[PDB]
Amino acid sequence: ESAFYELEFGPRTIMTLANFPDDVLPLLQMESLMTFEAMAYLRCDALVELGCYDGRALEIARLLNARYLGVDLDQRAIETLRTRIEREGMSDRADTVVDDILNHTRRGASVGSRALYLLPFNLLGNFREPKRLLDSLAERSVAAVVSVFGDSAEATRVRQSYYRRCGVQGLELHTRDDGTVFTGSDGFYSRSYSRACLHALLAECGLTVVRSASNLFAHCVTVLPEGADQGF
Amino acid sequence: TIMTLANFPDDVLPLLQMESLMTFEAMAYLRCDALVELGCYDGRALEIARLLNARYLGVDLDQRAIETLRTRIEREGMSDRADTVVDDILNHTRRGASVGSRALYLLPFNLLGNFREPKRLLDSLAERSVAAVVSVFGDSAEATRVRQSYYRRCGVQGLELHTRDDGTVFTGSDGFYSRSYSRACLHALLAECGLTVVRSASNLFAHCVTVLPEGADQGFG
Ligand SMILES: CSC[C@H]1O[C@@H](n2cnc3c(N)ncnc32)[C@H](O)[C@@H]1O
Ligand SMILES: CSC[C@H]1O[C@@H](n2cnc3c(N)ncnc32)[C@H](O)[C@@H]1O
Ligand code: NA
Ligand code: NA
């Protein structure tokens, strides 16, 4: 799992904004708005961004005066995030770890009292076995936001352009009933989801849907782990 | 050709994210039934209107970006609630038809800074808006570095950097102009144009403010 993101320039090629088709921005905006609103309503004092790169959700924590933890394998992107945290005077409230996401979710200390876990920008679709990641959220979180590419013809055309712009080698497209799977010879793996398939996967992993939003490109879901306390 | 993501350094994103969150929260709290995005490109605030079930009007002179937006509105089933106009921003604020009873006007991604006479635009907001969100580049060393890289990727000819106490000005031999703002200068300009700051946020790259036109009604619709 995540072999592609252990490559020196794996994360850089995928997360460089200049490599994004314009139509990626609506996916990122929907996910941002839903994370912001979820943290307020569910009284989360902490945001944990899995695959944060250079801190793509830091502004959400900033405008809510929430604690922030960014987790990524990419040392260079985390150093950019550390530099911004210091310059923003957020060192007391915002932290970073260079580590595997599953190392963090399985063994990492709690962040704040009521943490929301963000799985942004199709992170879940980059796991061949997404149930291992989803199952690990229960321990340290009272909520999660999961953002994935959808399976519309338009979404697939965006992804065809995006992954080639990123320079993914030997890119192949595999069409399935419930999503489109892209693979690369470099260990690249990215699937999209139908709304029904995403909802079914979440229910299977004991994650209750409280909010579900879709646009032409993406599905974004706010979930509560069953067994999570829902106090204030 | 300044709006395609292909031309954006990574450090542009925190500016876009801060103004999106402040526009979203302003629409909800101030009970705005319409979002009017000035310089909307391909509908960079459409998702805010969509997720609040608000009316939307995108104003831009980029007819390609507007046609992209019109198709997105149709495919999202938003035709009855979202529209576009290929118009000059000041012509729209001066003479354009009103949208909803409580419209919020968004001035995104340093639109105010890309105007040489910003007072004309700000003064025009008085009549037709109950609220506005204004997003500008700041004057940090990091903001100036990001802007230089951005304008270079946009292919501005004879790009020159002019240092000032209240914001860095970039010019080109092609007639390109864009200024950043200190927090103090932005607040002073808005006050001068009868716009009261109700929310003010800054990050390393940007200032974003929510304003009410003084004399604008503040009911619930
Ligand atoms: C938003 S999905 C892509 C981002 O997530 C990061 N990422 C992907 N898989 C992992 C993983 N297993 N552990 C940590 N970061 C990861 C990548 O380095 C990139 O910044
Ligand atoms: C965010 S500022 C840049 C955006 O605003 C648009 N724009 C700039 N000046 C004007 C103008 N005077 N009238 C309408 N749109 C404009 C550009 O086409 C671009 O999409
Ligand atoms: Na995800
Ligand atoms: Na959309």
Numbering used by the authors:
A (entry chain A): 14 to 245
B (entry chain B): 26 to 246
Give sentences copied directly from the paper behind this entry.
Interestingly, the Fo-Fc electron density maps reveal that MTA and AZE are bound to the active site, suggesting that the substrate has been converted via an intramolecular nucleophilic nitrogen attack on the Cγ-carbon. Intriguingly, the structural superposition of AzeJ:SAH with AzeJ:MTA:AZE only shows marginal changes of the four-membered AZE-ring in the active site (rmsd = 0.3 Å, 221 Cα-atoms), except that the nitrogen and Cγ-atoms are moved by 1.5 Å towards each other. The amine group of AZE forms hydrogen bonds with the hydroxyl group of Tyr175 and the carbonyl oxygen of Phe134. Strong cation-π interactions with Phe134 indicate a protonated state of the nitrogen atom in the AZE product. Based on the atomic insights, we propose that during cyclisation the positive charge of the sulfonium group migrates to the C-N bond and accumulates on the AZE amine. This charge distribution is stabilised by cation-π interactions with Phe134, thereby facilitating the subsequent cleavage of the Cγ-S bond, which ultimately forms the neutral molecule MTA. Moreover, the AzeJ:MTA:AZE structure provides insights into how the α-amine of SAM, protonated under physiological conditions (SAM-NH3+), can be deprotonated. Similarly as seen in AzeJ:SAH, the carboxylate of AZE forms three hydrogen bonds with Asn139, Y176 and S203. The latter two residues further coordinate with Arg172, which is additionally H-bonded to Thr193 and a water molecule.
